[PDB]
Design a protein around this ligand. Sequence first.
Ligand SMILES: Cc1ncc(COP(=O)(O)O)c(CNCC(=O)O)c1O
Ligand SMILES: Cc1ncc(COP(=O)(O)O)c(CNCC(=O)O)c1O
Ligand SMILES: Cc1ncc(COP(=O)(O)O)c(CNCC(=O)O)c1O
Ligand SMILES: Cc1ncc(COP(=O)(O)O)c(CNCC(=O)O)c1O
Lengths: 391, 391, 391, 391
Amino acid sequence: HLDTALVNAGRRKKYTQGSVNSVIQRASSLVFDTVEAKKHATRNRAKGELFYGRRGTLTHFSLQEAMCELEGGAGCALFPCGAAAVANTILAFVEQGDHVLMTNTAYEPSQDFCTKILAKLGVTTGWFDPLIGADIANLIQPNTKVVFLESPGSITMEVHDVPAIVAAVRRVAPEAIIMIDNTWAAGVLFKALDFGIDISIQAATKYLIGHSDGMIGTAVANARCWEQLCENAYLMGQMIDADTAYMTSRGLRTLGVRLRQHHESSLRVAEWLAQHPQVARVNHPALPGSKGHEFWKRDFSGSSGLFSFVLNKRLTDAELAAYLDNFSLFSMAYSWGGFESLILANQPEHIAAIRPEAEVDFSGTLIRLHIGLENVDDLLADLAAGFARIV
Amino acid sequence: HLDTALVNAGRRKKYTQGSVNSVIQRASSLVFDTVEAKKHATRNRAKGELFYGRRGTLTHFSLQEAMCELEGGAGCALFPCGAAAVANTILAFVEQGDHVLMTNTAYEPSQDFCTKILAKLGVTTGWFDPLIGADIANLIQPNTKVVFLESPGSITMEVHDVPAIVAAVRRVAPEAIIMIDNTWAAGVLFKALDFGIDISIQAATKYLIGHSDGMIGTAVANARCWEQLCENAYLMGQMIDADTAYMTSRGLRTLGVRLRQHHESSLRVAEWLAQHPQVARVNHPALPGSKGHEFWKRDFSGSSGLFSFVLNKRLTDAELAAYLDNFSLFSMAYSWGGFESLILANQPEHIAAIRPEAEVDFSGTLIRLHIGLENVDDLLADLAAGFARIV
Amino acid sequence: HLDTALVNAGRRKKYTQGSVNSVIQRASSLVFDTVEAKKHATRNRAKGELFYGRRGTLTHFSLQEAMCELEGGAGCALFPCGAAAVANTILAFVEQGDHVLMTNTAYEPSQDFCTKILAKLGVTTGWFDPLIGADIANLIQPNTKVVFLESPGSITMEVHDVPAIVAAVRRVAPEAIIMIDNTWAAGVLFKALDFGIDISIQAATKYLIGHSDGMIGTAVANARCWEQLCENAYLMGQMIDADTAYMTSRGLRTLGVRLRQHHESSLRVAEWLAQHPQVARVNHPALPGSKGHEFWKRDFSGSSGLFSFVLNKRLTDAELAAYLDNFSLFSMAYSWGGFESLILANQPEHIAAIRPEAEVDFSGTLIRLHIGLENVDDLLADLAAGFARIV
Amino acid sequence: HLDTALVNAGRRKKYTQGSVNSVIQRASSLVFDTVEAKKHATRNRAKGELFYGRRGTLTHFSLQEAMCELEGGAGCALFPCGAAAVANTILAFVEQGDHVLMTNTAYEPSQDFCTKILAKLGVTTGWFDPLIGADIANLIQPNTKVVFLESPGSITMEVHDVPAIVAAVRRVAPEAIIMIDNTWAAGVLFKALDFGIDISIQAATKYLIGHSDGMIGTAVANARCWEQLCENAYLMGQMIDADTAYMTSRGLRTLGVRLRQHHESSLRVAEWLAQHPQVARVNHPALPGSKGHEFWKRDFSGSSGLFSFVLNKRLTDAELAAYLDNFSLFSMAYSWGGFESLILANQPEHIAAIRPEAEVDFSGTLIRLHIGLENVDDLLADLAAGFARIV
Ligand SMILES: Cc1ncc(COP(=O)(O)O)c(CNCC(=O)O)c1O
Ligand SMILES: Cc1ncc(COP(=O)(O)O)c(CNCC(=O)O)c1O
Ligand SMILES: Cc1ncc(COP(=O)(O)O)c(CNCC(=O)O)c1O
Ligand SMILES: Cc1ncc(COP(=O)(O)O)c(CNCC(=O)O)c1O
């Protein structure tokens, strides 16, 4: 029933006022007809009554309701982008003297927030290998407050054993705040809260928006953590504009059909790459043999379209240009989750530099692909032409 | 020449591409045609080359250029709202052990960020009376890193003697970061950076947007402080959407003709209130006798339309409803800076509770007015009817 | 390669300027830097140079290029909605004394334009049964200027034999303008201009927008008819706003994946209805046995999700309310082509009244369904519950 | 009280739902909760009940209410631009055999609609000098259905004696439909429907939008003519998108303070030009001695900022480039009514060619200026520098 839920989540008449989609209510000022209405709005300023634009309008409330339904949460906080959701969700739960334990495959801006901002504020960060599983218990310190997961990992796509990690954390520090950056799954292919994670964070920028033309972050928390997340993020002034909230709700309505196509196409590309003589390794959560693939198969309900692979050699700078500059359909850009296919390259030492306290286990150039909605045979031909430029 | 500058600031062909206003470029992904173009964009990712949507698109670059011209700064950082600009601009310059010195008339959410977020990060906040002037030197501690001004003050409208404050800070701690919330002046009626302030922060939500239908914060920094502001705000994921950036640029184009009307009308209302038997005090920076009026007359080039007054009595709850619930033109809402007139009330003890380490010097109910663009005689008739309901 | 074409159509650097999607250029005024540039823009004011907002901005040019590529036309005119495209495209080619020959299954507002507007301007209109095929030749008068097709027909879904109609028209009246309302096919499941039709009109409101939140009409003409269409529509001031043009281009990027789901789901529902004891007839072009199905099978490349069926009785007012008022997933609304499922009822005598010079051949209430993106088993359960309410 | 009316027109709780401005309701489909509600909406589909997006959503209804209040009409029809409003408002009231009598100073596209569209549909058009006054009676034919006014005229700015024209029409042809293109007055500086005109048409593109970034037309009709205008324009599919309707309502809120500045600055420039040795004539309705000034003074409540003047020679193309290419503040573009100043040149023989059955009474190049919101002394200096380039 996920497709039905995606079509209907948040679409109630109090928000739509007769249209199919929520109205767009643009506001800072929200008007109180009487002193008693103002008092009521104040009491309910975080409970869906119109109070002030920084808390939201009908358009935001509709999106928040949709996200809570789809991710099974008590509340959804909104942010100007994914990086803001990560940074402010972590910040909401720490004080000076605390420790954060974060996967070494976390998105680089998330790491840099920890090492360049949190550290200044008296909050330390330690690191773990994404396949650590139950052994994470040994890394929990007396002051560990937050455990931060990201599955699959950024770039290299390792999938955590979330049940093993969560069980170990709860044994040692049942009160800890467990968070996950659930962007790759779009919050719906992995139902994080059902696994005992406290907060599921997404760059709604990616698959929820789905068209590469809006930026927005979300964080859906369970009942234990919601009030602290909501109020501390509000104290940092975190919000999103009404129009982007509308566009995120709108993206939900095609998320199912889109994801099924990204899954089908990216798996086909990954299977083809795995047979290719110029490819050393394919990092796709759905491909047999990929790191944590057995946890993806057990714990996820599908795949998206982002993955990576390692070439059979380290490209020279001349080869990198010959390869990347001459694609016809794949484009070079950051971000992903849109309708179009993207390609980027990283050398192994570049990845090692963003794997704290760890090395990488490959020596070829790594290529990250986002597989969009183009015909897959056309995408395969584009990749084949690229291989011919470097063979 | 301010009106000419407001019409033209940021409106260059590289952003407008033939239209009068900037194009609206909605993006996360920004495409690099070659590896070398990507390297160039990376080196210039904070210098106006398209790199990634979190840094901005053409639409943001146009607004940033306009704000730097109008406020005389080296760079302009963008935020989802004014409160995010205040919180993240302060956060960008502090670390555990630092001290912030803030006017006791600061906007309440700014105070709450200090007491409820900064405090648990090991950053202490002290307070000063807005008329302290040169005596602020005695409050500067070895660990004072930030001095935070707001002139006129929130609600009660006291105007600082900025030249005296800045000179005192520079004598004792010249490296300190002096910031101002310059929202009431819309950043243009008081040229903060020409007075030796380091960073001018605004809720562009107010007069820059001008229509009560968008939220956005700005912070314009001098060359000394720009890199740290830019990079630390970016690590917190702070940005605004392209469409709100467009609407802020658009608001600049009528800001001069709007502010002149708000000034003319609000001063007429303030002069009338000052003669009224039911009014104890009028707090309008432009009205003779108001706190810091001589600094407003010396240091500002105009007034906006927000001010307050104190009634000759403390209204009962029944009188508050009779007064506020029955206006025909003034509405109750938070925010201000739009085309319509607004009214709110506060009891003295409510204000005292947001004047840290200080008491208030009045006992009547305080009324805050925003004077919009309606005909002033109609607004006066509405206020007169209000007075008759409580006489 | 249609999916690749849909992802990339119109997305050239001159329109996108570095983002994935076109920029949104909002304009009436377009600025000429020199008199020489103004002269060049004037000469090329219908050839893709920026001249005046009524002709379009970069955003419109990008959509027009996409529509010409996808429908194989020489030019694409834009209109405020589908009905404006129909009315103004017909008007662009008639003058007093002319005759229009239109299918009797044409959309009712299209018929009303002919009988209420054209008739008082000296232009007569005659009618044909949608399955007339080659016998249309005997209805062509010496003054027949326009032959207007709609396949499938509105409401009742009959599919024309376009090859037989076009061949008959060209034998008798080679210079006639053959037009089609190609909305049901979204202009891509039936390539009208490859069949010898001169102009393909769409309510881009439906599947191109795809989300029920924008209105826009398009008309794509061959080289023979383009100049007259363009210039006469322009004389009537026909245009669309830049933002809706952007959203139409954006809809193209998911059109393929959406249509495949609408086809799969709607055919499954039709097959179930076609064996259902409370259903007298199913009108779905893709269902064997439906009127004109053999032509759909030969001439179309797929199906959308709009179709109708006839109940085993004419519902009374109490029965119609018990049926329609209590659906859980299907909603009552006009329009279609969006992500959500819709239901409407038409009584047979109502349809007969909008079948000029013709009778209907059924007596039960007709139900028109739009099958959206919800889970099809959930939709079937909703329809089954409906049947139980009227059994 | 106009400023108060402009701030408040159309801003009722049913449309704003708690915000200051209307909600933006984007919709084709509008959902009926029950068959009973659909029946009610159908009966009232042109009477302000939500029925279908082509009729409008809450956002349109709010704008329509505002326009009817401000112009004193029974209804307001919306169109994609001003030219569509003119063409479709005329078309709504003519049939084969009718005659249209139009001022020879009408906007050129309005003339071209008459000569190129209406003529081939059996509707003839004749012409009259804008100062004809009461002598227009002699030109009214038995089949004259529409008398079309435009005051001030396009380009040359002549002001009609509307009382004299209307009285003559009513004496000879009381049932005629009298229309005016009231764009220059923004519908509010000349209350056309109080002078016995039946329909006031505007390019809301100009001063109502006020920022050069939207296009929209309006036609406000009296009770006698509303139903025919509404229903015939709807049969042509004429509508505007919800977002442009919102931006038009939003423009009303600053229209008063904008127009006062355009009046002040443009009259100052006109007075300067009227004493300048390089100027042969100044065409500004507010300038004493301009054609029809005495009617402007009697019948209008203010002036906008668009006017023209005639140079002391017909400039060559080389002089036009030297003059126009090198302005610093004035830009070349079509349209007007925005915040920036614009300049265009018209040769006398080109104007004569769009003065049907009449000649011009000047031989110098005509310069049309739009005076924006820049500082007027800067604009005067820009014009002076232009004079020096051609002296
Ligand atoms: C896994 C993951 N988490 C957060 C972000 C940041 O979201 P944004 O809206 O961009 O602030 C991303 C961003 N990725 C860019 C890239 O991978 O190229 C992310 O992938
Ligand atoms: C002086 C001042 N500074 C910051 C803000 C916050 O801006 P926002 O965009 O709302 O986050 C304000 C806000 N004012 C609301 C009120 O005064 O009622 C402000 O006044
Ligand atoms: C087949 C077909 N052709 C034109 C239109 C009109 O488009 P719009 O954008 O609404 O002006 C439609 C519209 N139909 C409404 C309905 O079927 O309920 C159409 O179906
Ligand atoms: C007086 C007058 N009436 C109608 C229009 C057309 O409006 P639009 O929204 O542009 O279709 C205009 C147009 N003017 C362009 C120009 O004068 O340069 C007009 O002036």
